[PDB]
Amino acid sequence: MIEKQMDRVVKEMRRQLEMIDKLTTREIEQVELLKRIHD
Amino acid sequence: EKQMDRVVKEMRRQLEMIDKLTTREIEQVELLKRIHDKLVVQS
Amino acid sequence: MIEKQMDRVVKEMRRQLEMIDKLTTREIEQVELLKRIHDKLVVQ
Amino acid sequence: VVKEMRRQLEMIDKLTTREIEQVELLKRIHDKLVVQSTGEI
Numbered sequence A: 001m002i003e004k005q006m007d008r009v010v011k012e013m014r015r016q017l018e019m020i021d022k023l024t025t026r027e028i029e030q031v032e033l034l035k036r037i038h039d
Numbered sequence B: 001e002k003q004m005d006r007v008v009k010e011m012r013r014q015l016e017m018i019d020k021l022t023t024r025e026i027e028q029v030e031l032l033k034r035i036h037d038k039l040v041v042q043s
Numbered sequence C: 001m002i003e004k005q006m007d008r009v010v011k012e013m014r015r016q017l018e019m020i021d022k023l024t025t026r027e028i029e030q031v032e033l034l035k036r037i038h039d040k041l042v043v044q
Numbered sequence D: 001v002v003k004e005m006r007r008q009l010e011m012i013d014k015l016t017t018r019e020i021e022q023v024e025l026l027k028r029i030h031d032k033l034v035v036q037s038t039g040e041i
């Protein structure tokens, strides 16, 4: 009982962390792109 | 920026749930310790 | 010492112990992932 | 976009701190159980 709930919360945190990983990655690539084109 | 906060807020949210679950786990361990100690020290 | 009873308590301690090890290692991977994200974001 | 990155850096740092404290707390519970198994448990 407490064990599934806790397992379920950990699994769900890893998923939100993956979202942050991509977002930050996409933000870094967007900065790199904008740097080239801006005067 | 709006998508990040949505994910952090849900992460911070998921962190509090874990904190409460850990508290209930401690209570379980404290009781298990009480039982363990009684079996050892009673006759 | 009634070890029949004691053996149930030990079985339950080892089980809790195994569960906690799984949670800490999975949380540790997140901490590791968070550190990498921190490194990436910090390069700028 | 740059400003928001430095802002997200602090947010990630704060999440790292909260998760480490949780790891620390679970480790403390683990260390208590171990000891209680040392009597040939």
Ligand code: NI
Pocket (backbone or CB within 6 Å): C017, C021, D030
């Ligand atoms: Ni262990």
Ligand code: NI
Pocket (backbone or CB within 6 Å): B036, D035, D036, D037, D038, D039, D040, D041
């Ligand atoms: Ni013991």
